[PDB]
């Protein structure tokens, strides 16, 4: 009843890294977006983010997060998703597009960006590729 | 709202000690020895060792100053290279008999080490500060080391936008989580451990954005706060975190009158010899319409704790469905206690830490470290509300009087580089006196108290040095009237000697001594000579101290009229007599009139004896 979204993408020494897109779960205060270890020197400390690789976000339950797809290009891994605009007073869900540095691991790089098609007659992303 | 303070002390009329280093600035760290009688400043780019009974005497220095390609990496960082580029010593706490444990901003790489107090050197153990100690010079910041572990709180990273309070324990280092229940936009007070099965506690206070009000901007709220000394986190949730910590809002108000208090700029701890309970002075501003007003409430620890330990959490809900608004939770709380410490009770119940709690509390502690009551000060009300006057900092001392009557002694000072002493009389506030520390009305950042048998100080701290003060001037009153009227606990006059001496400091007889607290100088036993020219003008002098009390003359037994011609007044106090001439001449009187309770107060303030010449 609640989307998850993966890429497997390499460190700056080859390391294997997951991106994950968790979308909001009604305990799951988890942040929308991390970058986990998938193969770390402790391997019983493997899927764990390194407390800074995560977009912190105050209000989850608000932003109500739907992830639709994770996907790289160059040095880049992005994401596509629904989530509420709170900067409209409608505070409507809009399909946005994310972007993140592939070795940015505090997650400084991350910007996003909302979707239109076609001026969002259609406001609802489902799928891509 | 209190009065205006009673005495006004010009820095010039009073002995006060005074201590800075040439091109150095910003001495806001005050830490004094165990034996008292050395005050250690910690200032920006240095770290100094003063005689604290004569704070001019510098005995020690150490610098700490910023290289010239780590001030370009932060300006290059569009900060300040001459100003925030520069290493503001944040951390100056007792590390052991040989050493201290010191924190600087460090052109925005905050740094940590050990200065060796042999020596006065730095040990270049250059232990990275972030969580310790602010990247900006603007950044609030509150340390307490308790058993050689720092609790810090402050911002966790350069921009501010990570707040954090933690321990540096390496054993069990512990932090907050970085969500809004937790921490809302905190600005850092202060930090002390409230020492006692029944473990210690660090209490926290700041300022953050409330969750529980809704207003036309966002309200901030001052936050009583605890954590208990033995936490070591959760297990399989709240790993490395605090599982220990609830909060509370700390009220300072007036509602009869509509004023409200909510933004908290100091907390002092008054530990009574006698009182088995510590309370908490704390001075707060409101944050709208503060033009300026302050507001000094004492909260009894007592109080606070009831909270933490009985009262009910707060639930957050969602709301029409986008919204979250916070609400009284009366829903079934787990046992054992969420945010409780590991006490009697639960080590009956086989646990041993919070390592070994239930996921139950731990998971409900995490989304409920707010509390629906709030923390209420001591009578329901503050000890003081003044206007005019933005308070900085403050400090109290419990002093016995004469009668033995105990006076909770305030000691707040203001952002124009002035100290103000207060005490709660019969349910009225009297501001016994006001001193101008600072010559350049330079904003006291910190102060600290040194109650202790022979160095009786006050020391405060602003950006251009730092001034070191008694806690009272009985030495100023002339007459055994002006002794009593000041209504100073610290103040007794003393037949024998002739002069208004310091009660509990001075060497004097207890039994054959003058005090009342009700200003009745009837307890109290009991000629400038001027020849002026005919036709002339003459000026008789006359000078007071009470800011409460109006000076009059009398010429010839009769209350004279300053009115032209013939008078004037001169400064509002000096009389002018203009066409001298054979009548003139005889006894003027300059007299006093001020207010106690009910009864007017007169004194004769001078005496001249003016003779015109023919
Ligand atoms: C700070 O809060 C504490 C919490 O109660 C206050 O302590 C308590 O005050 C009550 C009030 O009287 C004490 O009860 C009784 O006192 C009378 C007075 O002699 C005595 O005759 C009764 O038999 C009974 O003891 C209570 O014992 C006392 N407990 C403690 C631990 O102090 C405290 O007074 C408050 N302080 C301030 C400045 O508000
Ligand atoms: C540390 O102590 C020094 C000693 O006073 C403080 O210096 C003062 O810094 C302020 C600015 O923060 C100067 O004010 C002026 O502001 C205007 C507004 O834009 C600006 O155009 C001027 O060029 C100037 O910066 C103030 O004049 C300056 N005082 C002196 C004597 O130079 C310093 O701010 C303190 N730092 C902290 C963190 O408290
Ligand atoms: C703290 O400072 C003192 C001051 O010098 C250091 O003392 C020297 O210690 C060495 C042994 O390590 C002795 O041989 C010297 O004679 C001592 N000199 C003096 C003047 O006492 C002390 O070692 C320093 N502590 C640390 C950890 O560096
Ligand atoms: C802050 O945390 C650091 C992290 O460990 C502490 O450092 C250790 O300090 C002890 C001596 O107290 C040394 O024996 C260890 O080897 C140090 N380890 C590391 C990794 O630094 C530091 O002491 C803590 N400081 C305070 C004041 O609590
Ligand atoms: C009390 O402090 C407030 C600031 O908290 C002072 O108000 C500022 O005064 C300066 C002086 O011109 C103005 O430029 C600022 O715009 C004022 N700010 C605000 C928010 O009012 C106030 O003047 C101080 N008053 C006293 C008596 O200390
Ligand atoms: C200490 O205070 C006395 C009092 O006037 C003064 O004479 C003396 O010079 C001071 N010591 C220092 C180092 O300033």
């Not at chain 1, 946005?96 to 979707?115: F, G, I, T």
């Amino acid at each position: 009843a609640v989307s998850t979204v993966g890429l497997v993408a390499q460190g700056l020494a080859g390391e294997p890294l997951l991106f994950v897109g968790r979308g909001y779960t009604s305990g799951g205060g988890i942040p929308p977006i991390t970058t986990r270890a998938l193969w770390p020197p402790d391997p019983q400390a493997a899927f764990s983010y390194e407390e800074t690789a995560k977009l912190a976000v105050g209000r989850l339950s608000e932003y109500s997060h739907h992830f639709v797809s994770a996907f790289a290009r160059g040095a880049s891994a992005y994401f596509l998703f629904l989530r509420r605009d709170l900067q409209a007073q409608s505070r409507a869900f809009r399909a946005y597009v994310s972007r993140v540095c592939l070795r940015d691991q505090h997650y400084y790089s991350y910007v996003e960006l909302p979707l239109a098609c076609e001026g969002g007659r259609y406001g609802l992303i489902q799928a891509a590729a | 709202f209190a009065p205006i303070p009673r005495i006004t002390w010009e820095h010039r009329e009073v002995h006060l000690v005074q201590f800075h280093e040439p091109d150095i600035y910003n001495y806001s760290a005050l830490l004094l020895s165990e034996d008292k009688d050395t005050l250690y400043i910690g200032a920006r780019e240095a770290v100094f060792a003063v005689n604290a009974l004569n704070i001019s005497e510098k005995q020690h220095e150490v610098y700490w100053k910023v290289s010239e390609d780590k001030k370009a990496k932060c300006a290059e960082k569009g900060k300040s290279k001459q100003t925030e580029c520069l290493n503001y010593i944040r951390v100056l706490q007792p590390l052991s008999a040989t050493s201290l444990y010191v924190c600087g901003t460090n052109a925005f790489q905050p740094a940590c080490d050990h200065l060796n107090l042999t020596s006065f050197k730095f040990l270049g153990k250059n232990e990275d500060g972030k969580g310790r100690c602010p990247f900006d010079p603007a950044h609030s910041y509150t340390s307490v080391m308790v058993d050689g572990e720092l609790y810090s709180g402050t911002s966790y990273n350069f921009l501010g936008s990570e707040p954090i309070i933690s321990r540096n324990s390496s054993h069990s280092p512990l932090r907050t989580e970085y969500a809004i229940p937790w921490l809302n936009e905190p600005s850092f007070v202060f930090a002390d451990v409230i020492r006692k099965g029944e473990d210690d506690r660090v209490y926290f206070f700041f300022t953050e954005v409330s969750v529980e009000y809704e207003f036309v901007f966002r309200v901030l709220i001052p936050r009583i706060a605890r954590v208990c000394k033995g936490d070591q986190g959760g297990l399989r949730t709240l790993q490395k975190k605090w599982t220990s910590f609830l909060k509370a809002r700390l009220i300072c108000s007036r509602p009869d009158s509509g004023l409200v208090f909510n933004v908290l700029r100091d907390v002092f701890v008054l530990r009574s010899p006698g009182l088995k309970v510590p309370v908490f002075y704390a001075l707060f501003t409101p944050q709208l319409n503060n033009v300026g007003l302050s507001a000094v409430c004492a909260y009894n620890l007592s109080t606070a704790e009831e909270v933490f330990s009985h009262g009910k959490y707060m639930q957050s809900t969602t709301v029409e469905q986008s919204h979250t608004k916070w609400v009284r939770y009366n829903g079934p709380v787990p046992k054992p206690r969420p945010g409780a410490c590991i006490d009697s009770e639960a080590r009956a119940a086989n646990y041993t830490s919070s390592l070994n709690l239930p996921d139950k509390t731990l998971q409900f502690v995490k989304d409920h470290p707010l509390m629906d009551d709030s923390v209420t000060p001591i009578d329901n009300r503050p000890r003081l509300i003044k206007k005019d006057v933005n308070y900085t900092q403050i400090v109290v001392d419990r002093t016995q009087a004469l009668d033995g009557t105990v006076y909770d002694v305030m000691f707040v000072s203001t952002d124009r580089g002035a100290l103000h002493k207060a005490i709660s009389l019969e349910h009225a506030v009297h501001i016994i006196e006001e001193t101008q520390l600072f010559q350049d009305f330079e904003p006291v950042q910190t102060l600290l108290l040194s109650s202790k048998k022979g160095n009786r100080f006050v020391y405060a701290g602003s950006n251009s040095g730092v001034v070191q003060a008694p806690l009272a001037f009985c030495g100023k009153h002339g007459t055994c009237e002006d002794c009593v009227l000041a209504r100073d606990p610290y103040c007794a006059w003393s037949p024998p000697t002739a002069t208004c001496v310091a009660l509990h400091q001075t060497e004097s007889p207890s039994r054959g001594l003058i005090q009342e607290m009700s200003g009745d100088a009837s307890v109290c036993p009991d000629y400038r000579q001027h020849f002026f020219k005919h036709g002339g003008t003459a000026e008789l002098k006359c000078s007071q101290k009470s800011n409460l009390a109006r000076v009059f003359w009398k010429f010839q037994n009769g209350v004279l009229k300053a009115e032209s011609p013939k008078y004037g007044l001169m400064g509002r106090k000096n009389l002018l007599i203009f066409n001298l001439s054979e009548g003139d001449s005889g006894v003027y009187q300059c007299l006093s009139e001020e207010r106690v309770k009910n009864k007017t107060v007169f004194q004769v303030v001078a005496k001249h004896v003016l003779e015109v010449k023919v």
